[PDB]
Design a protein around this ligand. Structure first.
Ligand SMILES: CCCCCCCCCCCCCCCCCC(=O)OC[C@H](COP(=O)([O-])OCC(O)COP(=O)([O-])OC[C@@H](COC(=O)CCCCCCCCCCCCCCCCC)OC(=O)CCCCCCCCCCCCCCCCC)OC(=O)CCCCCCCCCCCCCCCCC
Ligand SMILES: CCCCCCCCCCCCCCCCCC(=O)OC[C@H](COP(=O)([O-])OCC[N+](C)(C)C)OC(=O)CCCCCCCCCCCCCCCCC
Ligand SMILES: CCCCCCCCCCCCCCCCCC(=O)OC[C@H](COP(=O)(O)OCCN)OC(=O)CCCCCCCCCCCCCCCCC
Ligand SMILES: CCCCCCCCCCCCCCCCCC(=O)OC[C@H](COP(=O)(O)OCCN)OC(=O)CCCCCCCCCCCCCCCCC
Ligand SMILES: CCCCCCCCCCCCCCCCCC(=O)OC[C@H](COP(=O)(O)OCCN)OC(=O)CCCCCCCCCCCCCCCCC
Ligand SMILES: CCCCCCCCCCCCCCCCCC(=O)OC[C@H](COP(=O)(O)OCCN)OC(=O)CCCCCCCCCCCCCCCCC
Ligand SMILES: CCCCCCCCCCCCO[C@@H]1O[C@H](CO)[C@@H](O[C@H]2O[C@H](CO)[C@@H](O)[C@H](O)[C@H]2O)[C@H](O)[C@H]1O
Ligand SMILES: N=C(N)NC(=N)NCCc1ccc(I)c(Cl)c1
Ligand code: SF4
Ligand code: SF4
Ligand code: SF4
Lengths: 380, 176, 69, 56, 311, 145, 156
């Protein structure tokens, strides 16, 4: 049994035991991007900790913000206003497109199919513009916050999102022309990394790692949040539990994301975009500069921060990579006592050795890709 | 509600079997993949001619920091330290004292641009629009030390960029 | 645009064109303006050697016709 | 948008789609980069009476 | 006068290789909705020059090799043999007119695998040696079909002389009677030259420097061009007018250029084979068909009364 | 054929840049021979062009001046040379150029824009802006022990 | 004299070649790598500048440190730097690589990659935009244009 100290998002050290072509052992050595996020959060106010979540699955920034915001809102016993909830669903699904493009095209690029990366990353650049227009940043928006969102949509943004969405399914079609029926792509993915429904559950998998194996589970349907119960979409389900089925699930989820985006554009309601409660959400600048109460609350919200009633919650969402949750503990003060980040890729990568059984070295690249691993969230 | 992505039975009649044999032997699906890359060769590329052309940005863009003045030239910053308090990265350092005319002003205002996460929380917290993130993003340096901004650097940034900063603030302040 | 790929292709094409063109014109220059004689088999070599003696200048590509009869 | 009719036909045939209807390059259909000022609404707690904080 | 002729083959070969690096990058770029080199010289025409100079003035970091002689030997063999492959090519007149020219190209190309093997030994690292042996196994495996496919074609040509392929295709390209062999021949050249989707030396090491790196690269790209020139002659025979040989050279160059561009086209279009899968493409797919088509092409001229002449 | 109409458009770019010399100058300085409408020119010599038929991102561009603040910029152009008033227009943060919507004048605004000065004697050097905090006792200048 | 003149032109030639063919090895450590990918993506197409998308460490001229450098990773990064053939340059991209950024006070984070390798260009931002990184690469090109290796050699 030969041993390799490194074979094949971030940086991974894979220690593998080989026998000819076959992988006998796969021991991932992570922590190469462990930056003590969970400890740093204990020294921050709840608002100050929000940007740390952009930098976890740093391909799914606003989905990560949503999970943290929902957790804080639950502990605060407040709720974001309806328009903020629709904006949060709209950008969550835009973020899903951002993630799935990265997931599928870098998965293809890793095994030699380099061209779809370029086609789809021009679509990513256009969605980076939607991020920048609402938040001023292309990636780490810090836009979704406990109590709603930071600012309202600028005039004209919704029109451009409609223009982008109208053409996007054709871009998916071109991606499918390159990969879906290509015999080389199928050879690299079909019957690779098969996981049974029972093993997937017991190994802590979530998201496409479950649905690829036939399990009918999606937190947007079963445990819905902000307004997911008000939009219509289908959950793609696999039948073989392999990389190819998980590739197909992700491609179909992009189509369903566009379907959701179309509904969010049409049903976007009027109103304020953060909770009309100035002990949680900062007042408008014009009020802060005229009213005594508003100025005090602005001063206190940006120095001490709001206190959160003591308690603990496990809150999770259906992030693009699977179930993303935080176990957030409040001690009553304005700083969290503990914040454990449940990253779906942590359990998934823990299952690499199991999934790589009976496969060749080049299949490990395919299996890592099918899991969609970003070491920002694995290592935290 | 759900759908199946890959649950279909191939037709086992002779016509269908011969269709798949022709695909296997004549590489038809591979030739169809060649058609798509051929059509891209003849599309206009998406590349822009940087630095002669620039990517589009919005007034909200969070770039290089600057300290602003009133129209009279007086500094807006009154050393309240709200920005320093909110800064998620502890990138801001402030000292203050009464100015010779009794005004509440800073003697130190530093931003470590290599600690800063360019989050914009400082410009939200500021009650007087004194500290902003400006539109400049082309300020890479040859040394680490050049990115440790003191108050003189930040005031110079404000005087340098105020024309554009004011117009950008004019376009977005009703959303704030 | 795609036609900006052509200049590189043109340079490549001219580079591949020179070998064949040079050999053809060098052969004509060195063989009296004709194609270089091909002798794959002893018979062809025998006739080429006989031409060299018949030429009177030891050049197989110098032909003699009825004027020598 | 600047492609000649022949070149548009060639790439439409090669891809099998009507590419010209759904160009991936943006032209004049995008929204203006200068917009009229907004006037954002206020929330439900913007009232002068019957609005005690202890009830919300 | 003959030394002039040798130089007028060597120098254009090296220049064509240099600018194929530019063409590959720009063709790949436009298929990827971008431009590729367009700053270093107008339309990137100076990019190959900048790259060449850069590589040669780069520090030649060679780790203490287990064999100094074999470290030097490998690049010399690779480049020396690559240029030798061009000297029998009729364009339309070969530099060296060989009676067994086709056999000479087969024999020289079979030696090119030593540069892979020797560079593996010289690396002084069992990991690179194992990578070399995997590449050698791929190369020799696809040498089997190339030789048999070539033999099948020559049964319609009648000889091993390369210029006789020109005569054989005076009325019609050989790709029409032999498109099944042309298909497998073309894919075999991709795998032979370690081109995508058979670029498993590059992919596997992912999952040499300076001038010595540049020399291996030059030899590789010379082989790529030569393989496609060979394919054009073998299957897309250009007509030769003895009084206007340059019309042959123009038409034959265009076909070779297009075939070379199709190598770049294919690289842009597909994912990579697994190693065992490209081994199965050869031993379990190409070889059974090549053997059957070899039997067929022995019988066909006999049964149709279409045996070509020997001379 | 349109091939002729394309070739004619190619030839009009030569005359649109003022003959071959001007056409070649922009080819080598900017790698682009497109002809656009002159929006305006800043006091440093940069020229700003638009062509709204180009796709968004290529519809505005600047041909940089050959000299700025005493530096030869014929070949060494920089993105930091765009002054703030045109910076907004060039990056599409606004639709209207400073020739139609001039910036608001202020006494303190730099009248002379500076590009990136890193790596030169004009580079910024950080330092502490606060005065000494503790004053040391100075012993007397006369003897008395 | 001509001898000085010949040196001045040769320096221009080697400088032009080296800045015209900058092959980067990208250490894609964290989120800053995504913006590096968008610089290779079609809109900015760094390849058009002569900057090939992904070079091997032994064929590389510039290392781009694109993300947080943890303590666990620091030895590996220095090993790759030491294997780069010269001339070699380092571009530090983003606050994390520049000076630790958001994680500056962490127990597991190197406070700036310039504690491990010499750095030629610092690109600010969290992350710097793709355009900001491209500005930094172009700034590195101008730095190489200023080199006078041969002029200093002949005054030795
Ligand atoms: C094969 C090559 C054919 C040569 C003719 C190419 C041509 O003129 O088409 C341009 C013309 C414009 O194409 P487009 O995509 O619609 O461009 C959009 C705008 O119109 C674009 O036009 P515009 O609105 O932007 O107008 C301005 C532009 C307009 O551009 C032009 O002026 C056209 C310049 C092209 C001249 C090319 C000369 C070709 C010489 C052949 C030898 C080189 C190849 C080897 O001006 C320029 O920028 C000129 C820059 C000069 C570029 C360098 C051109 C010379 C390259 C050759 C150098 C050799 C020395 O294309 C056609 O009209 C189609 C006819 C050509 C047949 C195409 C067949 C494709 C292959 C079939 C499929 C098989 C694939 C394998
Ligand atoms: C074999 C020898 C071939 C030598 C090729 C010389 C390359 C000419 C060249 O430098 O390109 C023009 C270049 C163009 O200048 P540039 O490189 O600064 O380009 C500026 C334009 N942008 C902004 C788009 C990059 O000339 C020079 O750079 C001046 C140095 C000349 C170097 C050669 C001296 C000998
Ligand atoms: C009347 C009597 C006549 C008798 C003779 C009649 C003969 C004619 C009928 C037979 C036709 C023979 C076809 C010969 C081509 C080879 C066919 C072949 O091998 O295809 C199968 C091969 C593997 O197939 P696979 O899907 O993996 O499954 C099989 C294993 N279970 O699949 C492959 O090889 C796929 C190729 C992989 C490489 C992809 C990259 C190349 C794609 C672009 C190629 C463009 C076309 C090449 C043209 C070259 C021109 C010079
Ligand atoms: C460790 C380092 C390893 C490096 C090895 C690299 C290999 C480099 C290539 C080696 C060269 C081998 C020579 C093989 C040439 C065979 C080609 C041939 O058969 O024809 C050449 C010529 C006869 O021409 P032909 O047309 O076939 O017949 C005569 C006319 N009808 O026949 C002749 O011209 C006679 C030439 C005889 C001299 C050949 C000596 C070869 C020695 C090479 C070692
Ligand atoms: C499915 C995709 C597969 C892609 C693989 C790549 C294929 C590339 C094909 C390259 C060959 C294209 C042919 C280019 C023609 C060159 C111009 C020319 O001169 O054509 C002349 C030819 C007829 O003349 P000729 O070739 O001399 O034939 C007479 C028989 N000796 O013209 C008459 O026909
Ligand atoms: C144009 C078509 C028109 C249709 C009508 C024509 C009718 C006349 C022709 C009828 C011929 C039918 C004979 C077909 C035999 C097929 C045998 C077979 O199917 O075996 C397949 C199998 C190898 O496949 P494998 O994937 O490795 O293992 C199976 C597990 N899935 O089991 C094996 O081990 C494969 C058998 C061993 C390998 C045989 C190699 C063949 C010999 C190679 C040269 C090709 C033939 C002579 C040249
Ligand atoms: C293709 C023909 C081109 C003709 C051009 C002729 C130009 C001749 C001048 C060559 C200039 C080379 O410039 C020099 O190259 C070597 C590459 O090993 C670099 O590297 C060298 O110096 C560094 C220290 O400086 C050493 O650590 C290194 O081991 C050493 O190799 C130098 O840093 C660089 O200054
Ligand atoms: N694969 C590509 N086409 N690009 C690329 N990395 N080319 C390598 C660049 C190169 C190598 C040797 C020489 I000699 C020259 Cl002139 C240029
Ligand atoms: S942008 Fe954010 S990290 Fe930077 S100084 Fe302001 S508050 Fe601190
Ligand atoms: S910049 Fe604004 S928030 Fe910061 S100390 Fe000055 S006045 Fe206060
Ligand atoms: S500097 Fe910012 S974007 Fe870059 S790796 Fe660090 S947190 Fe991520």
């Amino acid at each position: 049994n030969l041993t390799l100290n490194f074979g094949p998002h971030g940086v991974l050290r894979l220690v593998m035991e080989l026998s000819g072509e076959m992988v006998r052992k796969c021991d991932p050595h992570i922590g190469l991007l462990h930056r003590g996020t969970e400890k740093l959060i204990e020294y921050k106010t709840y608002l100050q900790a929000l940007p740390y979540f952009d930098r976890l699955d740093y391909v799914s920034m606003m989905c990560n913000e949503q999970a943290y915001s929902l957790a804080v809102e639950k502990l605060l016993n407040i709720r974001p206003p309806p328009r903020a909830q629709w904006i949060r669903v709209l950008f969550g699904e835009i973020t899903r497109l951002l993630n799935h493009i990265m997931a599928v095209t870098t998965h293809a690029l890793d095994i030699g199919a380099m061209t779809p990366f370029f086609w789809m990353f021009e679509e990513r650049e256009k969605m980076f513009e939607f991020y920048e227009r609402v938040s001023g940043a292309r990636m780490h928006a810090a836009y979704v916050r406990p109590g709603g969102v930071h600012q309202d949509l600028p005039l004209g943004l919704m029109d451009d999102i409609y223009e982008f969405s109208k053409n996007f399914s054709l871009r998916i079609d071109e991606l499918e022309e390159m990969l879906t029926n290509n015999r080389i792509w199928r050879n690299r993915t079909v019957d690779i990394g098969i996981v049974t429904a029972e093993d997937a559950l017991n190994y802590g998998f979530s998201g496409v790692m479950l649905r690829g194996s036939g399990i009918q589970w999606d937190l947007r349907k079963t445990q819905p949040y902000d307004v997911y119960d008000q939009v219509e979409f289908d959950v793609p389900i696999g039948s073989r539990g392999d990389c190819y089925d998980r590739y197909l699930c992700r491609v179909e989820e992009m189509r369903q994301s566009i379907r959701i985006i179309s509904q969010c554009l049409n049903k976007m309601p009027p109103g304020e975009i953060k909770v009309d409660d100035a002990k949680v959400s900062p007042p408008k600048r014009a009020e802060m500069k005229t009213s005594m109460e508003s100025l005090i609350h602005h001063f206190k919200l940006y120095t001490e921060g709001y206190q959160v009633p003591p308690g603990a919650t496990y809150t999770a969402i259906e992030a693009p990579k699977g179930e993303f949750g935080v176990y957030l503990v409040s001690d009553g003060s304005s700083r969290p006592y503990r914040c454990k980040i449940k990253a779906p890729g942590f359990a998934h990568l823990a299952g690499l050795d199991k999934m790589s059984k009976g496969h060749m070295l080049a299949d490990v690249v395919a299996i890592i890709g099918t899991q969609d691993i970003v070491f920002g969230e694995v290592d935290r | 509600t759900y759908k199946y992505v890959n649950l279909r039975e191939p037709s086992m009649d002779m016509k269908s079997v011969t269709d798949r044999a022709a695909q296997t032997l004549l590489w038809t699906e591979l030739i169809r993949g060649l058609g798509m890359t051929l059509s891209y060769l003849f599309r206009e590329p998406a590349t822009i001619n940087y630095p002669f052309e620039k990517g589009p940005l919005s007034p909200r863009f969070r770039g290089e920091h600057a300290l602003r003045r009133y129209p009279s030239g007086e500094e807006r910053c009154i050393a309240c330290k709200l920005c320093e308090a909110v800064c998620p990265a502890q990138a801001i350092t402030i000292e203050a004292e009464p100015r010779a005319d009794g005004s509440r002003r800073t003697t130190r205002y530093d931003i470590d641009m290599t600690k800063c996460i360019y989050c914009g929380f400082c410009q939200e917290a500021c009650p007087v629009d004194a500290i902003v993130e400006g539109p400049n993003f082309e300020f890479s340096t040859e040394t680490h030390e050049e990115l440790l901004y003191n108050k003189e650097k930040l005031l110079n940034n404000g005087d340098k960029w105020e024309a554009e900063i004011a117009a950008n603030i004019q376009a977005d302040y009703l959303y704030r | 645009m795609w036609f900006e790929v052509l200049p590189g292709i043109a340079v490549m094409g001219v580079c591949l064109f020179i070998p064949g063109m040079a050999t053809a014109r060098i052969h004509r220059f060195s063989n009296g303006g004709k194609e270089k004689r091909v002798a794959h088999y002893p018979y062809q070599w025998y006739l080429m050697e006989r031409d060299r003696r018949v030429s009177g200048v030891n050049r197989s590509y110098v032909s003699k016709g009825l004027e020598n009869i | 948008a600047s492609a000649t009719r022949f070149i548009q036909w060639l790439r439409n045939w090669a891809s099998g789609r009507d590419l010209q209807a759904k160009l991936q390059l943006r032209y004049q259909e995008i929204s203006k980069r200068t917009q009229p000022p907004p006037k954002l609404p206020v929330g439900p707690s913007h009232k002068l009476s019957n609005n005690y904080y202890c009830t919300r | 006068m003959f030394m002039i002729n040798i130089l007028m083959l060597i120098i254009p070969i090296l220049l064509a290789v240099a600018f194929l690096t530019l063409v590959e990058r720009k063709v790949l770029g436009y298929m990827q909705l971008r431009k590729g080199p367009n700053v270093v010289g107008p339309y990137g025409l100076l990019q190959p020059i900048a790259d060449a100079i850069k590589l040669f003035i780069k520090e030649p970091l060679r780790p203490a090799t287990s064999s100094a002689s074999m470290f030097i030997l490998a690049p010399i063999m690779a480049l020396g043999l690559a240029l030798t492959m061009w000297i029998p090519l009729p364009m339309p007149y070969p530099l060296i007119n060989m009676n067994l020219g086709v056999l000479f190209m087969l024999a020289m190309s079979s030696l090119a695998v030593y540069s892979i093997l020797w560079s593996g030994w010289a690396s002084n690292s069992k990991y690179a040696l194992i990578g070399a042996l995997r590449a050698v196994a791929q190369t020799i495996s696809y040498e089997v079909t190339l030789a048999i496919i070539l033999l099948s074609v020559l049964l319609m040509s009648g000889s091993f002389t390369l210029s006789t392929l020109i005569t054989t295709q005076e009325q019609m390209w050989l790709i029409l009677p032999a498109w099944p062999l042309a298909m497998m021949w073309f894919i075999s050249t991709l795998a032979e030259t370690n081109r995508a989707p058979f670029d498993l030396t590059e992919g596997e090491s992912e999952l040499y420097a300076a001038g010595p790196f540049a020399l291996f690269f030059m030899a590789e790209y010379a082989n790529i061009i030569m393989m496609n020139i060979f394919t054009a002659i073998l299957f897309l025979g250009t007509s030769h007018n003895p009084h206007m040989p340059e019309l042959y050279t123009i038409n034959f160059t265009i076909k070779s250029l297009l075939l070379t561009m199709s190598f770049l086209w294919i690289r842009a279009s597909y994912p990579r084979f697994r190693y065992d899968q490209l081994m199965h493409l050869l031993w379990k797919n190409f070889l059974p068909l090549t053997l059957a088509l070899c039997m067929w092409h022995v019988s066909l001229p006999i049964l149709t009364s279409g045996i070509p002449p020997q001379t | 054929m349109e091939l002729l109409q394309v070739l004619k458009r190619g030839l009009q770019q030569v005359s649109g840049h003022g003959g071959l010399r001007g056409y070649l100058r922009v080819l080598f300085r900017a790698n682009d021979v497109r002809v656009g409408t002159l929006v305006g020119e800043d006091k440093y010599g940069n020229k700003y062009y638009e062509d709204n038929k180009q796709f968004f991102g290529r519809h505005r561009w600047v041909i940089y001046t050959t000299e700025m603040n005493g530096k030869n910029t014929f070949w060494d152009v920089d993105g930091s040379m765009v002054p703030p008033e045109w910076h907004r227009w060039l990056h599409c943060m606004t639709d209207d150029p400073p020739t139609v919507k001039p910036p608001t004048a202020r006494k303190f605004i730099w009248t002379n824009h500076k590009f990136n000065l890193s790596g030169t004697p004009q580079q910024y050097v950080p330092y502490s802006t606060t005065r000494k905090k503790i004053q040391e006792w100075v012993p007397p200048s006369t003897p008395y022990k | 004299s001509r001898g000085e003149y010949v040196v001045a032109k040769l320096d221009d030639l080697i400088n032009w070649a080296r800045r015209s063919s900058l092959w980067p090895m990208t250490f894609g450590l964290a989120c800053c790598a995504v913006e590096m990918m968008h610089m290779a993506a079609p809109r900015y197409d760094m390849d058009r500048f002569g900057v090939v998308f992904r070079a091997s460490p032994r064929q590389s001229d510039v290392m781009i440190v694109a993300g947080t450098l943890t303590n666990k990773m620091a030895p590996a990064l220095r090993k790759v730097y030491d294997q780069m053939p010269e001339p070699r340059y380092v571009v530090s991209m983003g606050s994390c690589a520049n000076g630790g950024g958001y994680y500056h006070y962490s127990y597991s984070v190197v406070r700036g990659c310039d504690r491990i390798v010499p750095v030629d260009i610092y690109v600010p931002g969290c992350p710097p935009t793709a355009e900001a990184l491209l500005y930094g690469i172009l700034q590195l090109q101008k730095k190489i244009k200023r080199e006078k290796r041969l002029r200093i050699w002949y005054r030795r």
